[PDB]
Amino acid sequence: SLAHQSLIRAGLEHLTEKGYSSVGVDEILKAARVPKGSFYHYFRNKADFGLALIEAYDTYFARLLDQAFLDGSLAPLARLRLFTRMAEEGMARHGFRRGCLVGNLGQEMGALPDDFRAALIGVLETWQRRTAQLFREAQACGELSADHDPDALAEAFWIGWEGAILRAKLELRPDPLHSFTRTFGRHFV
Amino acid sequence: DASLAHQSLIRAGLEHLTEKGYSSVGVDEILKAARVPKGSFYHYFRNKADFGLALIEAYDTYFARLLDQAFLDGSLAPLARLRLFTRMAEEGMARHGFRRGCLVGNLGQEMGALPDDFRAALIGVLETWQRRTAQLFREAQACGELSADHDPDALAEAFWIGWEGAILRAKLELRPDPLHSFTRTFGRHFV
Incomplete structure (x- = not known):
């Protein structure tokens, strides 16, 4: 029933917290409380x-x-x-x-x-396309100036945002998210 | 080469952990790359x-x-x-x-x-890099390259946050494009 969902859940918790290299199937089964056969x-x-x-x-x-x-x-x-x-x-x-x-x-x-x-890479690109579309819309109402490239700006947003999450998880605090967003925010008018 | 055991270990360590990471790399793999015995x-x-x-x-x-x-x-x-x-x-x-x-x-x-x-x-190493970079930015202000507007410490921190993420992306994509993309966009912060 909930065998599949518990495996996914256990997997997402362990990979967001540690990463793939650190975690084997046995850790996952203990955390999911699901038999190996599932x-x-x-x-x-x-x-x-x-x-x-x-x-x-x-x-x-x-x-x-x-x-x-x-x-x-x-x-x-x-x-x-x-x-x-x-x-x-x-x-x-x-x-x-x-x-x-x-x-x-x-x-x-x-x-x-x-x-x-x-x-x-496909997942990162899907997010950048979505952010580019948001940025084109910011240009249409003068929130972002015409001399910016929405696609280049979207790529820079995701590059830096993942960097901010790396630092927040390392320092166990929000401050790196705030630094990133406060400085990146200065690309807007 | 007995007198080279420590450098070999460090070398193999740096190579393997910059390519993979700590969780991926065991001691036996390091020894085999360094060609040094376990006792060393x-x-x-x-x-x-x-x-x-x-x-x-x-x-x-x-x-x-x-x-x-x-x-x-x-x-x-x-x-x-x-x-x-x-x-x-x-x-x-x-x-x-x-x-x-x-x-x-x-x-x-x-x-x-x-x-x-x-x-x-x-965290210690990163903060060192950030302190050197803010000092760079203070000199950029004192000579008119950066506007008096900007906080050199905040900008130094944003540089190192973004640059590590650009490196992440360059190693994932196996190309320098994310590096150029990051610096091109970051360069707008300057006069």
Whole structure:
């Protein structure tokens, strides 16, 4: 019933907090409280579980961006600030111990299976396209000046935001999120 | 080569942890790459954790020398010294096909799986880099390159937050594009 969901849940908690290299199937089963036979009913092996976890994180995180980026009661820049504020509230729930599954996996790329590279890049690119669209909308109402490139700016936002999450999880506090967003915010009029 | 055992260990450590990370790399893999016996490893280090801290101290020392080349070059304006550093760091990364990143960024990201000693050691190195960079930015203000408007410490912190994330992305994509993308956009903060 809840065998599959408990495995996904256990996987997302362990990979946002530690990363893939640190965690084996046995840790996962203890945390999920699910028999080994259920693990192998859903996934062929650890690498295949890893990919399922990437995909599940992408589906969840898309709903988070829906909530912020599609809130038409908010001017476009205020949507970006709602996003970073909500992302920080989510981190504060577990005292900043848990970061981004994608940034964690991204940093370990050298020890991951090759399949992972294109799946991680696809997810980062989906987010950048969405942020670029938000930034074009900020230009249309003069929140961001015409001499900026929305795509370049979207790529820089995600580069720095993952860097901010790395630092917040290292320091176990929100201050790096605030530094990043306060300085990046100066690209706007 | 018996007299080379310590450098071999550090070398193999730096190579393997900049390419993979701490959680991925066991002592046996280090020994096999260093071609030194186990008794030589334990002569110098009490365990993997003591080794890892020694690698951070080694990386701090060698990295400080690369910053010295850029940040202490008096033939360059302050902001040109910052562009030199990023150019150099990219050249370094390009030598090994962008497969090797920052040791401090790699370990920082896997902090949840590390002995708690590492936290202060990793944060210490980053704060050093940030202090050198803010000083660079204060000199950029004192000569008109940066507007009196900006906080040099906040900007130094935002630089190191963003640069570690650009390196992450360059090692993931195996290309310098995220580096150029980051610095191109960050360069707008300057006059």
